[PDB]
Amino acid sequence: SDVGTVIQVGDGIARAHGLDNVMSGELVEFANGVMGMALNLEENNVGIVILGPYTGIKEGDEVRRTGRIMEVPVGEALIGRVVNPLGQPVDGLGPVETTETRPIESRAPGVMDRRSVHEPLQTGIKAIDALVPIGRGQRELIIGDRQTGKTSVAIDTIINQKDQNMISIYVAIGQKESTVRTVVETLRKHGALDYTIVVTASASQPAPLLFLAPYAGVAMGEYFMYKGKHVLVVYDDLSKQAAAYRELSLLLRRPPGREAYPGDIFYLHSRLLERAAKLSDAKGGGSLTALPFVETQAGDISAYIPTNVISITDGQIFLQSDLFFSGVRPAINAGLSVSRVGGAAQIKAMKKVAGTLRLDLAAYRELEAFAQKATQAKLARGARTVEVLKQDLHQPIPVEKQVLIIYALTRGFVEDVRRFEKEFYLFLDQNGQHLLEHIRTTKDLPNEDDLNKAIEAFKKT
Amino acid sequence: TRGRVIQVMGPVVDVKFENGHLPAIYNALKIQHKARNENEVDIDLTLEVALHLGDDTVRTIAMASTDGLIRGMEVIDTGAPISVPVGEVTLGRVFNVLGEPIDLEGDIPADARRDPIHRPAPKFEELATEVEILETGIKVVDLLAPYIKGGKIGLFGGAGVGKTVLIQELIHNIAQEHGGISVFAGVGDRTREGNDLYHEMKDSGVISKTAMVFGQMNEPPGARMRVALTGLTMAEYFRDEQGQDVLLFIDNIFRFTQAGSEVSALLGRMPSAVGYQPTLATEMGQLQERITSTAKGSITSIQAIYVPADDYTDPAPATTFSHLDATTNLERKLAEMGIYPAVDPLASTSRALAPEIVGEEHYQVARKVQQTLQRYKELQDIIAILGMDELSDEDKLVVHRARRIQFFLSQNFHVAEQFTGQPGSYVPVKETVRGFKEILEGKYDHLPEDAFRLVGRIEEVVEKAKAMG
Amino acid sequence: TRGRVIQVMGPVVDVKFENGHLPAIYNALKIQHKARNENEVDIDLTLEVALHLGDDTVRTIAMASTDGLIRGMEVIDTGAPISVPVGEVTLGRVFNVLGEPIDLEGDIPADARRDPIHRPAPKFEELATEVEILETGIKVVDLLAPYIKGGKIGLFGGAGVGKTVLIQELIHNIAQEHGGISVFAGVGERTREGNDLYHEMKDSGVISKTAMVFGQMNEPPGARMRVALTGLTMAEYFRDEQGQDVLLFIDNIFRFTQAGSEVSALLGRMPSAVGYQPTLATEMGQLQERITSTAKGSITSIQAIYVPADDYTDPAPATTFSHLDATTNLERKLAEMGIYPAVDPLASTSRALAPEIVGEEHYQVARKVQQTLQRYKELQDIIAILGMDELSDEDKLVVHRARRIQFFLSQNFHVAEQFTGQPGSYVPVKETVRGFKEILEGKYDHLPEDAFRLVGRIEEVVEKAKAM
Amino acid sequence: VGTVIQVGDGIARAHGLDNVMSGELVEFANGVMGMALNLEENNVGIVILGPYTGIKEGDEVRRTGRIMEVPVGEALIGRVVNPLGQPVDGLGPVETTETRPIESRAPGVMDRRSVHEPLQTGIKAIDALVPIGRGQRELIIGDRQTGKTSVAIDTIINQKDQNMISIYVAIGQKESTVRTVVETLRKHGALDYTIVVTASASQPAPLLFLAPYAGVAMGEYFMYKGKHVLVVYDD
Amino acid sequence: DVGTVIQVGDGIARAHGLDNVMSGELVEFANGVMGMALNLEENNVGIVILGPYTGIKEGDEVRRTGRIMEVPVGEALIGRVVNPLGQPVDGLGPVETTETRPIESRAPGVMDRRSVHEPLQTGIKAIDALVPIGRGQRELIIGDRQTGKTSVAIDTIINQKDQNMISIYVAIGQKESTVRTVVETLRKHGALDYTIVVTASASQPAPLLFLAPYAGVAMGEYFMYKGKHVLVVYDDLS
Ligand SMILES: Nc1ncnc2c1ncn2[C@@H]1O[C@H](COP(=O)(O)OP(=O)(O)NP(=O)(O)O)[C@@H](O)[C@H]1O
Ligand SMILES: Nc1ncnc2c1ncn2[C@@H]1O[C@H](COP(=O)(O)OP(=O)(O)NP(=O)(O)O)[C@@H](O)[C@H]1O
Numbered sequence A: 001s002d003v004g005t006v007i008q009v010g011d012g013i014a015r016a017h018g019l020d021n022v023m024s025g026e027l028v029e030f031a032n033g034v035m036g037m038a039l040n041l042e043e044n045n046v047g048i049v050i051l052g053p054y055t056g057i058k059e060g061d062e063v064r065r066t067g068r069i070m071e072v073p074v075g076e077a078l079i080g081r082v083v084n085p086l087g088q089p090v091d092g093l094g095p096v097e098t099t100e101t102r103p104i105e106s107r108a109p110g111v112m113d114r115r116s117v118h119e120p121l122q123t124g125i126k127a128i129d130a131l132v133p134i135g136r137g138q139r140e141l142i143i144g145d146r147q148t149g150k151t152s153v154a155i156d157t158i159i160n161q162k163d164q165n166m167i168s169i170y171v172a173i174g175q176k177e178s179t180v181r182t183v184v185e186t187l188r189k190h191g192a193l194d195y196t197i198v199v200t201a202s203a204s205q206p207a208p209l210l211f212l213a214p215y216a217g218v219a220m221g222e223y224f225m226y227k228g229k230h231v232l233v234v235y236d237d238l239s240k241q242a243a244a245y246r247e248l249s250l251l252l253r254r255p256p257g258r259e260a261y262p263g264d265i266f267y268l269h270s271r272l273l274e275r276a277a278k279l280s281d282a283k284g285g286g287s288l289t290a291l292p293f294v295e296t297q298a299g300d301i302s303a304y305i306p307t308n309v310i311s312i313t314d315g316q317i318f319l320q321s322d323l324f325f326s327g328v329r330p331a332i333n334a335g336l337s338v339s340r341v342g343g344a345a346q347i348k349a350m351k352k353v354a355g356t357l358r359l360d361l362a363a364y365r366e367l368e369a370f371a372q373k374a375t376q377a378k379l380a381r382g383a384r385t386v387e388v389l390k391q392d393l394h395q396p397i398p399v400e401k402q403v404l405i406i407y408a409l410t411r412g413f414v415e416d417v418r419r420f421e422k423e424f425y426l427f428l429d430q431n432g433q434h435l436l437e438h439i440r441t442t443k444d445l446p447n448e449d450d451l452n453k454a455i456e457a458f459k460k461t
Numbered sequence B: 001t002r003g004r005v006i007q008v009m010g011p012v013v014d015v016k017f018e019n020g021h022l023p024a025i026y027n028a029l030k031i032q033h034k035a036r037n038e039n040e041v042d043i044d045l046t047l048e049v050a051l052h053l054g055d056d057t058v059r060t061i062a063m064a065s066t067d068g069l070i071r072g073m074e075v076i077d078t079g080a081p082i083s084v085p086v087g088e089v090t091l092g093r094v095f096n097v098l099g100e101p102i103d104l105e106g107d108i109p110a111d112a113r114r115d116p117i118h119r120p121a122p123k124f125e126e127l128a129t130e131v132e133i134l135e136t137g138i139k140v141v142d143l144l145a146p147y148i149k150g151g152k153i154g155l156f157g158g159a160g161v162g163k164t165v166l167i168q169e170l171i172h173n174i175a176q177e178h179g180g181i182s183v184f185a186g187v188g189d190r191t192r193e194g195n196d197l198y199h200e201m202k203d204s205g206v207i208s209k210t211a212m213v214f215g216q217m218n219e220p221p222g223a224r225m226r227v228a229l230t231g232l233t234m235a236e237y238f239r240d241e242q243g244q245d246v247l248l249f250i251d252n253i254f255r256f257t258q259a260g261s262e263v264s265a266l267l268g269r270m271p272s273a274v275g276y277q278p279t280l281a282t283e284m285g286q287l288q289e290r291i292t293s294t295a296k297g298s299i300t301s302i303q304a305i306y307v308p309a310d311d312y313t314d315p316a317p318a319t320t321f322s323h324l325d326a327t328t329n330l331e332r333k334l335a336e337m338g339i340y341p342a343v344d345p346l347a348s349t350s351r352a353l354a355p356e357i358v359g360e361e362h363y364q365v366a367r368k369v370q371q372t373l374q375r376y377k378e379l380q381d382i383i384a385i386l387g388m389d390e391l392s393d394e395d396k397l398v399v400h401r402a403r404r405i406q407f408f409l410s411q412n413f414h415v416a417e418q419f420t421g422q423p424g425s426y427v428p429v430k431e432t433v434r435g436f437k438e439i440l441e442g443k444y445d446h447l448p449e450d451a452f453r454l455v456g457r458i459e460e461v462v463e464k465a466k467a468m469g
Numbered sequence C: 001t002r003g004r005v006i007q008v009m010g011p012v013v014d015v016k017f018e019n020g021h022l023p024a025i026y027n028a029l030k031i032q033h034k035a036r037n038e039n040e041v042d043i044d045l046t047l048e049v050a051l052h053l054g055d056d057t058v059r060t061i062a063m064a065s066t067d068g069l070i071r072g073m074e075v076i077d078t079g080a081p082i083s084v085p086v087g088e089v090t091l092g093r094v095f096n097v098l099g100e101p102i103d104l105e106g107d108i109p110a111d112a113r114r115d116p117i118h119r120p121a122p123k124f125e126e127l128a129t130e131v132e133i134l135e136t137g138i139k140v141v142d143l144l145a146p147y148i149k150g151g152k153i154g155l156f157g158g159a160g161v162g163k164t165v166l167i168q169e170l171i172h173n174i175a176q177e178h179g180g181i182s183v184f185a186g187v188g189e190r191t192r193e194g195n196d197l198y199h200e201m202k203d204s205g206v207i208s209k210t211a212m213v214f215g216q217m218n219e220p221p222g223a224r225m226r227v228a229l230t231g232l233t234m235a236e237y238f239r240d241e242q243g244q245d246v247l248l249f250i251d252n253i254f255r256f257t258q259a260g261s262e263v264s265a266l267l268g269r270m271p272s273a274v275g276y277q278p279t280l281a282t283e284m285g286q287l288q289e290r291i292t293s294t295a296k297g298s299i300t301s302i303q304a305i306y307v308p309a310d311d312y313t314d315p316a317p318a319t320t321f322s323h324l325d326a327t328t329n330l331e332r333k334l335a336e337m338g339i340y341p342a343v344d345p346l347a348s349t350s351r352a353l354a355p356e357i358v359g360e361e362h363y364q365v366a367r368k369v370q371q372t373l374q375r376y377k378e379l380q381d382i383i384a385i386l387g388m389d390e391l392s393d394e395d396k397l398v399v400h401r402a403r404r405i406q407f408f409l410s411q412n413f414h415v416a417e418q419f420t421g422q423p424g425s426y427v428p429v430k431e432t433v434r435g436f437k438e439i440l441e442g443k444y445d446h447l448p449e450d451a452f453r454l455v456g457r458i459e460e461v462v463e464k465a466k467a468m
Numbered sequence D: 001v002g003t004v005i006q007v008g009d010g011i012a013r014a015h016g017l018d019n020v021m022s023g024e025l026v027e028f029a030n031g032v033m034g035m036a037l038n039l040e041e042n043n044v045g046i047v048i049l050g051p052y053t054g055i056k057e058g059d060e061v062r063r064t065g066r067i068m069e070v071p072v073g074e075a076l077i078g079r080v081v082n083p084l085g086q087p088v089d090g091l092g093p094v095e096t097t098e099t100r101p102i103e104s105r106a107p108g109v110m111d112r113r114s115v116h117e118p119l120q121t122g123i124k125a126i127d128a129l130v131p132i133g134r135g136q137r138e139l140i141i142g143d144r145q146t147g148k149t150s151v152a153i154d155t156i157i158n159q160k161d162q163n164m165i166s167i168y169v170a171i172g173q174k175e176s177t178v179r180t181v182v183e184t185l186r187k188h189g190a191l192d193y194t195i196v197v198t199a200s201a202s203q204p205a206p207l208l209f210l211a212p213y214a215g216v217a218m219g220e221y222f223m224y225k226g227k228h229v230l231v232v233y234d235d
Numbered sequence E: 001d002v003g004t005v006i007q008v009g010d011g012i013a014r015a016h017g018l019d020n021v022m023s024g025e026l027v028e029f030a031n032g033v034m035g036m037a038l039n040l041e042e043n044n045v046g047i048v049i050l051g052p053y054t055g056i057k058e059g060d061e062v063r064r065t066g067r068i069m070e071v072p073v074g075e076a077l078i079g080r081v082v083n084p085l086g087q088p089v090d091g092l093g094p095v096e097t098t099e100t101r102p103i104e105s106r107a108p109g110v111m112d113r114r115s116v117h118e119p120l121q122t123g124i125k126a127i128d129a130l131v132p133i134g135r136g137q138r139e140l141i142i143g144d145r146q147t148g149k150t151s152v153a154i155d156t157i158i159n160q161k162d163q164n165m166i167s168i169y170v171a172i173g174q175k176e177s178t179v180r181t182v183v184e185t186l187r188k189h190g191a192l193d194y195t196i197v198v199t200a201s202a203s204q205p206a207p208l209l210f211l212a213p214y215a216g217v218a219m220g221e222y223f224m225y226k227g228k229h230v231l232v233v234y235d236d237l238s
């Protein structure tokens, strides 16, 4: 029969004698109540990775075949809940009662199943929406040193986007079990929880459950797709998932490579990040975009994992630690960060104003090292554009407001600049309805004369 | 129903059993033997199971010296984890890692309840999170990185920067008057300090509210791991079943992970990048995920991690940042400038540095200080090569201030009275937040370079300068 | 013959051919299976042989991402390597590694003519020797590193430097006019670009004269290795028999090497140096010597190379450097400076810089510009410490003119309209040599440096200053 | 005679071959030659000098009974040859009668003589400031480019009036480059006193391993018969 | 209690049999050299040779000493230069010491220590004046080569006659020229009549260099446990 016995147990890795018909990726059950995943089939033994606490298994334990590839239960019954990489709820509150499951080792959709990135996406931060734009369906990478202003990006993005018909999946990976509460509660303070799902895999749980932690969330967002939607997925960190895969591979008796990291890492990431797609009209016209996070030692962007990761994503936002303390928040480097989709998915008001502003800020950064009358004006304009882009925590600004102040910035209109922003917002909120409605409706800049009298009237006040 | 020993490799023993009697992980084994011939030696030994390697064998790690283990001897399995006393009876006493008394003052009978060491971490429905300030009176710490009750505070430093000095200063300033149960686990420190603090506690009358276990350097690799767990299994009971706030102090918890690297190469595992065991993250997580607060009480633990060199990129200390709630970093290069404590202002951070929890006047000065220090850090190469006189007037004025701020970060500790002509001084939070304002606005910045060294409040600076002429 | 699968570790599958007849190396084989019950998954897949062992066992490399492989499955031999369709049927199509179509325009029948991928290289007595200048309109490339027609051309770059924009400018400018059969093969880039390019081709009208092959990242190394040689298998039949000229763009051949690393650790080979497989040179030469121009037909080939860690002293770039006829290097420093393209003039060299091919009007100006840009490199570093007026005025003139020379190297491209929002401009080589002669003549000392950023013909500069 | 057991990447391990000596040639049914380099207890390691795709497990291997031999002769001058004794330019056979072993011993200390007679290449810098004698070995080290091949071409071309039988070797290089160099030399008639040894990239790495040994074996015969010989390596 | 040696590789050996052998035990080869056991596998024992291994062959008989790593101690070693194994260096007859100490003994721990308040008179002005030392303290001497580290230890050990402290000097991996210069200086000044000098030169196998400090401290603490004061110095830990 499809039965076997275990003759080696250690660190969540077991070796099984028997189990002739076990397929690769198949689940296999123990009598203790915790499942296992097969990753190797030698001549006479099978390599099993245990999917939970391992204090109960003993040599000679019987192990039984189940007969199904990796699954995640998905559906609208999970919105608002907090769940493990498997379908077991974390916050209690009873079982989730799902019926359907997805096989998440399925093939990624291919060519002619895809379309160009077209609809804009906004986080409410002037630093990201303007200089380094993001489009719905893009994969944009956030890499940086520890404690430099990362998680705020995702949390403020989910907070701002409550106005839309979107669905968000957020995952915390390898973090201490309690660490998530400050996140989970803060969403509920602004109400952002009522349309999202949170997935957690703590350090208390075994390392292998980190290796499936980012796989399941993209499958949840996948099942929400294949119908017309707009879906986001965030993994709070992948580097610990890479370490978990490394230390999973090592005990399986598989030789190492360039580092302790095995050479399959690229393949793994290719299996993950490529799962996203912006499907065409004949497929459903959805959108699944991801915001991966990656950490490197001492901010060394030239290391193995950073360079490996960059080769797959559609861009990168580089958070630099030495600008963090200088007073530029978020500390996005306008010179090094890149976005590949560019102006494909962006409202047409921003094209007329700040389509190329990024090259201006990069040139100002390059000229700073040399500067340490045309050059004087360039330096003044660069200092001001650096000053404008700053934002604070949990105070997003809607997409309809950014273009109006960017127009004043990019049309030649320092101690008081930041308050000039807020007072200008007040002046608009009380008078400029005739411009704001037009921006809301046609997504194009209104008459330049009227904007000019409005701006000059403010400046006179 | 008994075991045998067939293979010995130092810290590792490869015990063997019979069918159906295989122990579980963390189970305890006991070996006793008396000399049958004059060529043998008498030793009583205890062992901890770690791996199962088939063919009716399990790997175990020795808890004491393994010298003289003749092959073929008998082994006893207790069937239960290592059990250590806990509760009221453990206050004022001292034990080793195995749990027996080592203070020689007396025994502890079986009527005192004892629990297993290893238990799973609490579920998400049991945890709680709240933020509130724990105060120490240290100028450099209380401003740029205030501590949080029930959180984790980490100390980072090289092979001697003053970690133990800071730990003992915190104990002298907090642990006695906090009102909570105190536990000090002497993990991997010098035995001289371990027996010095015993006098320091008994002669001062604080020993009536303290519990301690020791695992110092002389002990074999198996013992150096479980000292932290044996220390934590008592603070857990003090938090839960008695509803008391608990403070826990650990000095060299890093000696945990290093110990693993000693034994892993003998257990039979493949090596990691720099030879570590390929379980660093998971084992450290299983260690630090039990130091948590709950809805019934709070556990606050201050720990220090031994950095193997002046390189923070080493995986073992780098992966510690996944658990800390407040961070303090030390470096030799600031210690050598004559400034104590040599806490780096641009790498120590805390979650409590938020404007709704500390007020505007606190966040403003903290951010201003960090911003002003960043520029002076950046000007390093050019001031070093050619001189401070090269820069412009607006940069020269900035150069005039950062070193004074760094000097003002110094303060005389209470344990430094034996090395300094003045005793330790105290500066409250309301005073440390106030102090930097005067220097930032130029109220006292014109004083000379050395007057800001080894000072308390800002008023003492001016009288010390007057004493200097 | 028949075989049974006995071991599987993912990318590598170990089979046993007990039938007494053992397939030869590089022979493809097939597996088909239908479920015995509702727990199994029906499968149908090919695999490729790469070794032998002394128990009638064979090791095979996986070219498709697979889960659900079982023990005891049966394997049947094909008896030939991977076959690629060639001829009239191939034009205006997109194919996968095994030769099946990717687009939804329909099937291709079995009467088509197919060529095997792997053949021995040409010989010494038949390779062409004469070369000619090819004009692309790219200011730097057409001047300092001309692409000799019929030779190999290499684009060296790091991560996110700007290779793809330049390569798509090349396929836009050249293939639209050149009548040769064009083949674009992608080995390691992103799937989104590959899917966008097919639609852009369907609009451009080049689809009638072009064929494409794909498979990209979402597959194991087995497909990423052979996807490079599939397009060459097409170009080989177009050159050897039909005889027309051929354009061959090959994209990120580095991943042909990198893929070979990932299987290597499982095939029993030891690591070497940084970690690459020991058969680097032997595996790479069997490819780099197949794409050559012959006396019968001329092949013009462009390739993309990605530096593994932005640093060139790496065995993969060292091994690749020995086969190119002209290389252009890209430095990420130039990417961050905001002067695109990021071609560094210093390390860019070509066989065309000879007096009998480009003439004397080319050599002197190119050498003077090259020497000035080499001279400025150390003076600008001295400036970082010594100051800005402590150096003599004659020395400062070198910077004063080298800044303009470097800025004028930028060009406003036609395929970058999405990132630039501008239609661009066009220049012939005569205007390039002419403009560099003027910039060295001293006619433009008083125009601001910032006016030279992202302009084409020199005549535009005086307009931009007029705009300012 | 023995059987082949393991095949891969041009390397084979065979069982049998009881009396095979180290360095002995072996042959297969396919006609490609091989060299024995490792002698274990139950297997012999054969390294193959040609295309290996056609060899199968179970093929028979035959011992040749001789060490490496390379044919030499004055008539070879002008011809382009492989590191092994095979024609690559066509034009019939190689026109040789005598063959030399590759394992010739180096001369003893008492068989040598001081050197004071020079060699010339025609460049002011190298011919003067870093002089070379007609018995000297001189090292050229560098990265790609910088014009290393020009030194070899000048050393070969300039030896017009002063007799010097020359051997240029290009190891592992693309065949188009070596043909271009050959034609550039042909414009100056250097083929009247030069021999070229080429082993392309498509050729197995063992030919690259054996190339310089042939580049000295083909050049020592004119010495030991009383003629002056120059040998230059491309890489 | 018999067996055969089957590997003699690079100063390490493997032995068959030896059923009753204990960890850390001394072992003797039939050639007349001492060795020790550090690892006991399922069917073989690993042995580390403490002398000249050039005389060991396969099949040699190997024998059990029957006790743990004990080095002789006592007053009879005073006035002699001894090998760590317990053999005199400059002749002068065999040693008469009867008592022995295991050099792996468990160190004293809690309830067995006390603070320090009394100095170790060194006589070097710049040290005692700036960086004081007390009995029970462990002071690192660390630094660069060719600067005079040993000249500190020699002066410190000559100054100890007035404090009546039996002492030990340990030389590790060192050149015999300096060793005999130091020995001649000590015998001239008379320090050898209460100090004990142990040496393990650079021409000696690595295991002796590895074990020398353990014997140097085991022969020193014995006088402590009898109430006397002891100073111990090591020539190089690197
Ligand atoms: N826009 C902002 N302005 C000011 N402070 C900010 C801003 N965004 C983030 N922060 C600061 O960032 C701190 C949190 O650090 P952060 O870098 O977000 O954690 P993290 O690195 O994401 N930890 P992790 O969850 O492992 O990624 C907060 O306490 C804020 O003080
Ligand atoms: N306020 C101070 N003034 C001057 N020196 C000080 C002061 N505080 C600490 N030190 C010095 O700092 C040194 C380090 O103290 P100590 O705690 O013994 O070392 P350590 O950092 O704990 N190394 P370790 O305990 O072995 O991990 C002490 O020996 C003192 O010389």
Ligand SMILES: Nc1ncnc2c1ncn2[C@@H]1O[C@H](COP(=O)(O)OP(=O)(O)NP(=O)(O)O)[C@@H](O)[C@H]1O
Residues within 6 Å of the ligand: A310, A311, A338, A339, A340, A341, C157, C158, C159, C160, C161, C162, C163, C164, C165, C189, C252, C306, C340, C413, C416, C419, C420
């Ligand atoms: N003329 C230009 N102006 C502005 N931005 C440009 C220009 N040319 C290229 N870029 C930017 O540079 C990026 C380079 O993309 P791409 O060429 O794919 O990177 P790459 O060099 O190929 N690295 P990779 O794709 O991983 O091999 C583009 O996505 C643009 O954002």
Ligand SMILES: Nc1ncnc2c1ncn2[C@@H]1O[C@H](COP(=O)(O)OP(=O)(O)NP(=O)(O)O)[C@@H](O)[C@H]1O
Residues within 6 Å of the ligand: C350, C351, C353, D143, D144, D145, D146, D147, D148, D149, D150, D234
């Ligand atoms: N004296 C010289 N003056 C100018 N150019 C020279 C000179 N000598 C050689 N060259 C150049 O050398 C080039 C030939 O390539 P070369 O730099 O010699 O390749 P190499 O890497 O140095 N040797 P190889 O490994 O065989 O390619 C030609 O383009 C010449 O312009």
Ligand SMILES: Nc1ncnc2c1ncn2[C@@H]1O[C@H](COP(=O)(O)OP(=O)(O)NP(=O)(O)O)[C@@H](O)[C@H]1O
Residues within 6 Å of the ligand: E144, E145, E146, E147, E148, E149, E150, E151, E152
């Ligand atoms: N304090 C001193 N005053 C004067 N001369 C000294 C002093 N110390 C040492 N010397 C002389 O310098 C020489 C070097 O001293 P020595 O003690 O041999 O150095 P060392 O410690 O052995 N160096 P090394 O062998 O690398 O450890 C001695 O032989 C003396 O001649």
Ligand SMILES: [Mg+2]
Residues within 6 Å of the ligand: A150, A151, A152
């Ligand atoms: Mg965060």
Ligand SMILES: [Mg+2]
Residues within 6 Å of the ligand: B162, B163, B164, B165
């Ligand atoms: Mg200390």
Ligand SMILES: [Mg+2]
Residues within 6 Å of the ligand: C163, C164, C165, C189
């Ligand atoms: Mg690209």
Ligand SMILES: [Mg+2]
Residues within 6 Å of the ligand: D147, D148, D149, D150
């Ligand atoms: Mg050359």
Ligand SMILES: [Mg+2]
Residues within 6 Å of the ligand: E149, E150
């Ligand atoms: Mg010395």
